[PDB]
Design an enzyme around this catalytic site. Structure first.
Site, PDB file in Angstrom:
ATOM      1  CB  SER B  96      -0.876   0.009   1.234  1.00 58.99           C
ATOM      2  OG  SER B  96      -2.285   0.890   0.837  1.00 58.99           O
ATOM      3  CG  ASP B 220      -7.346  -2.980  -2.592  1.00 57.79           C
ATOM      4  OD1 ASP B 220      -7.786  -2.306  -1.850  1.00 57.79           O
ATOM      5  OD2 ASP B 220      -5.977  -3.110  -2.638  1.00 57.79           O
ATOM      6  CG  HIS B 248      -5.715  -2.838   1.050  1.00 63.39           C
ATOM      7  ND1 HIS B 248      -5.168  -2.498  -0.121  1.00 63.39           N
ATOM      8  CD2 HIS B 248      -5.410  -1.813   2.041  1.00 63.39           C
ATOM      9  CE1 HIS B 248      -4.392  -1.533   0.220  1.00 63.39           C
ATOM     10  NE2 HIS B 248      -4.464  -0.994   1.551  1.00 63.39           N
TER      11      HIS B 248
END
Lengths: 268, 269
Positions: B96, B220, B248
């Site tokens: 991320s 996600d 995610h």
């Protein structure tokens, strides 16, 4: 004049872009900047070629980061210049440290943009002594040079000037040269000297395929003439042109032969 | 190993440095810490790799200064970690926001210490929508998160946890993950959200040269799968492994697949 180009890490790199026709990319020596090629630059423009003068990160009008003075990072800067400006059929001239940077660029990014290479007073394949390479400064001499530059840079520069030319040029000329180096960043100057001491391109020379002219002064006290014999021995197809009356600064000691030779090669 | 690395500004960076043999530097997402990788770390350690889990400034056990949450400064901190621990041949994984920082680190400091890059649910090349990049939260959606953290950070987090995973995980597992984020400094959490909102690596992707693997959840909601398509097109030679069953948080949604893909790639590019 001339834009700034962004390096991969964002550093602004000043490039002087002047004249018309096929490109001649000139790469300066330590610790000067692109204005050292002034006389060649003039001569290119009247012969109908395009001069491309880059100031390395840390020098002249470029930004001076805390990092990136090794030949890999410098060669990536040259790559960005060639990319933004979309240059092909390049005559790439590297003077002294610039010769090292030019070789690293070819090695790391490929040879297809460069029609010919000129190595002038080049600090190549090594600036300092190695096994089977008993020429030039030792690392310890370069360290003493780094010490001097941390004690009094202007006096180091004066000394460097004294060994840079075989002939005694007029004071205003020597002063203009001295001031190119004084406006270098002090930290860029130092980190580049660290790169000069350590970089070794011996494994890469036999890999070079570009047509190559080697220009070198017989009296060179900065990069000894023996370097030029090694470059000619290791680059296949290369031509050696010996500047019999010149030290490191052949661009003044034999200004006319230097620039006629450059011009004749960029034509041919 | 131990403890803390000095950043350029003197901020102390905590690093969980564990094992011997080849380094796998793992960079966490917002707003958690290196402990989110525990299930992966367990496997890297038994396979005889060395885990280097960085807690960014503002997170985990690191100092949380006022400033420097921009990817440039964060990437500088990663440079310090690698340079001061004298690592080479590293496998660099960014999850991320970690993805974004990993890229910036490669652009700002080069690739000479890194053998391969893994980008896992990465917030890249941009986390928020732009001109011809109509994917992700808009800038005003991230301002909404920032506003919420300034009023009730744990409630903000519970809300983010709800959009983080495709599957409902056991209550004790979710609480663990929640508490990793509650540990974060409030002010780092805010400043990194601002970098999430504003940072844009589109120009930089084609400058990446290192062998890359992109791992991304089809479901996600945080970093939409479209980010992965963009990364795969623009990073040279990148491979893409799609996590069909993951949001995610693939590291729990498809724990086993995520771990054993990561391990295989550390073993060979």
């Amino acid at each position: 004049m001339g834009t700034f180009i962004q390096a991969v890490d964002g550093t602004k790199i000043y490039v002087e872009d002047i004249g018309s026709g096929q490109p001649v990319v000139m790469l300066h020596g330590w610790p000067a900047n692109n204005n050292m090629f002034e006389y060649q630059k003039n001569r290119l423009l009247e012969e109908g070629y395009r001069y491309i003068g880059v100031d390395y990160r840390g020098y002249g009008k470029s930004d001076a980061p805390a990092t990136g003075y090794d030949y890999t990072t410098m060669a990536s800067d040259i790559n960005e210049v060639i990319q933004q400006l979309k240059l092909t059929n390049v005559t790439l001239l590297g003077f002294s440290m610039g010769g090292g940077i030019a070789l690293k660029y070819l090695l790391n990014h490929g040879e297809s943009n460069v029609s010919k290479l000129i190595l002038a007073g080049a600090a190549a394949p090594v600036f300092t002594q190695r096994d089977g390479y008993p020429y030039g400064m030792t690392k310890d001499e370069v360290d003493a040079l780094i010490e001097d530059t941390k004690q009094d840079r202007p006096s180091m520069l004066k000394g460097f000037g004294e060994i840079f030319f075989a002939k005694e040029h007029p004071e205003p000329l020597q002063q203009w040269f001295h001031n190119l180096s004084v406006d270098a960043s002090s930290h860029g100057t130092i980190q580049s000297a660290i790169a000069l001491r350590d970089e070794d391109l011996r494994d890469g020379l036999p890999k070079i395929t570009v047509d190559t002219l080697i220009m070198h002064g017989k009296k060179d006290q900065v990069c000894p003439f023996e370097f030029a014999e090694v470059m000619h021995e290791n680059i296949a197809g290369s031509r050696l042109e010996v500047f019999e009356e010149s030290g490191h600064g052949m661009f003044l000691d034999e200004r006319e032969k230097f620039t006629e030779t450059l011009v004749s090669y960029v034509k041919s």
